Write a protein that binds this ligand. Sequence first.
Ligand code: ZN
Lengths: 416, 400
Amino acid sequence: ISRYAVPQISKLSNGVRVATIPVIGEATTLGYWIKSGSMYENASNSGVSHYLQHVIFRGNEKYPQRKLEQLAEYEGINLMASTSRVTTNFNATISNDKLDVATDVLSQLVLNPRIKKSIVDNERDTILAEEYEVSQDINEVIWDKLHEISFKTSIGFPILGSHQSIQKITTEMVQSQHSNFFNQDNLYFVAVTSLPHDVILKSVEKATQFLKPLASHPKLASDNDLHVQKFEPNQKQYLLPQLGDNAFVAIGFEAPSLDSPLYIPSQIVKSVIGSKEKYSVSPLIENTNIRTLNSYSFPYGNSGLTAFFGNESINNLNGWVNTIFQSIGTIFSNENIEGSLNVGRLCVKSQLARGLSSTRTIADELGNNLLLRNEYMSLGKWDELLNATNINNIKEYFDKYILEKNASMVIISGKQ
Amino acid sequence: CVSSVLPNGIHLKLMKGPRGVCSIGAVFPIGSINSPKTADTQVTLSSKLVESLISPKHVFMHQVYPFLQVNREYSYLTLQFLPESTTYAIESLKRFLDGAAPANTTFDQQKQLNYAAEQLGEYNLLEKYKDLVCMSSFSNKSYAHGNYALQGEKIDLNPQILKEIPKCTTLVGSIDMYEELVKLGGSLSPFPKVKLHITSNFEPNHVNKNVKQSSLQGSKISMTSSLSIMSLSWPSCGAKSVEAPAYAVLSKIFGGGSEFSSLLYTKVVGGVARCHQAYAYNNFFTTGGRFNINVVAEDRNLVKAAQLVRECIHSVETIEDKNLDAARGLVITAGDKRFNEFVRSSYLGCKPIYSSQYKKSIKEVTRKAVEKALKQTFSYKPAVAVYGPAVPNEIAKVFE
Ligand SMILES: [Zn+2]
């Protein structure tokens, strides 16, 4: 756990900003958070950010693949990476006696890669298989289809790239993404730790001794205003008869930007609908027998997407759609809005409480917060903002985002 | 762990650590073997749980996270929540322990969910290995009772176990729930039942669960619904044995992995075309253990996989020091899931997987201890269980 804290941030003379937040315990999560992701791509390089992420982790001169494998096996340096639409990270969760090796590996891999045609060409099959695998989880497929028909802009791209895009990715494209997106001024080193701030700082200093300062600062290729998103509600239906007597469906609305005063209202409304679990279903849902329900709301630059999705038997599909639309409408009723606000606020608080017990979760929020917000948002200010959120804020959110708005919708049917 | 005994005899075990999420629950020695068939226990306890929580809406509105684990010989219920939901959570645990049968309508709803388990993502590869092991490696045939009914078979409420639960319950909780659990425990009848339950002896049976799999499982079009599963079991040791950490190390030496680096991975996953995955587990029961190696592959290829598993066994005897240390390293995984492990380890009477004491145990396992474990386990003929049509005796021949 973590004690309503605040990060401490120092900048090395080479430009690398080191952000730490104090945590009790013996686990440390640390690594690099970079504003690199599919939002910053176009049609010509779709999939490159994720493709780079893999190449990075295929090792460099100092730490080739065999040396990496050896470090996980014998030395307990278990490296993790992921790429989203908006950010990328390379991290390790470690015992504290492993600090210098971990800061050294991560710095070398992220900031000193050696990107070769052979490693790039050799990686292609791994990414093709990953794309195949994700394509067999219909929650992932319908999530991507919903993004695709809602955004003609780059948010509509799958993170991995289409099959065709994965095949066309060149070494030059991978090197270009690293050269334009992985500089000191587009990233933070993050550590969630008991170790003092200065210990992390010196260790990163030592790990990044090869790194020369930037001569200049061209406008970051990751700036949101270079990738203005346009949400346009559309409907598309697909077949997948391998599903049998089953269909997937997803409903989408535009959501507020992260810095919108209406962001927290959208999170509360999304949460009060929430997900269906084995024992748990929103009081807004009338037919509690619906097979399943998942709700998400993400910000994407000037835009964002609120999504509701599930699967049902063919005969229950249309009823699922009505239940969800009815539940969303029910929040706006003056008899229900107060209670919806209260329950939704509690949902957001419970989600927060659950995040505070893991150094991995804390690291990811801190890294994302630093990259994506104008100014750092503490859990402190966040809770006050949640507590000060009122019925008029919810109404204004409904007025701007929900009421009288066309929704996107995708259906993938076993029969249709 | 802070361990107490209430004035009425009820045991109370508390997990130390920082505040944030409150945890409560109950663990008791009633499992799928205490009903006359597969799923009877599971659906009885599930029916009871949903009634105890009043409605799914109450659960959501209080943001309570319930979790029910039914095993062959024992089960537990945990509830996680923020401090403002304490009253509802405790009152729900109290109702669960009140002995009353659920309504037939609740039971009917729960039965339908149970039949749908595989389609719903609730009957995954892990649960299949457990059923295959339990239906094949015990002399007592009651261990064949799992949690997930076959499509053509009946499921019946077992009201007697609901009466039995409060008579053999241990209460569990995070340390901040001490006062509320003392009080809840106090409300239960003195004094607990004491039953000698003993894990059934090993027997190397050869069985099939030749049953079709649904194409959609959860949200995935399963990459395994057309493949067979081979589970090979040998007896090992109780969770309390001095030998258990050697067994954990022995399971990492075999290890495994998916097509989507250790003996099972390199030799079995690498050696059979279209072998989706292979893994070794060491699974614990009240007084014993089953060391099990599970292979997912096409039906025609299982015999070959078994030959490659035999090779893995032979290979362990000459394992290098590098690898014996790496195996020791792999067991050390520190990382909600913490409380569930606390409860599990409290029943087994072993040190939790996250504890430093456990980590120290693992650091202290020798080559001798691993060799001893290997010798006594692989001296038995394996139990053999196939999810699919493959003839288990043909697989069994590979080891005789
Ligand atoms: Zn990937």
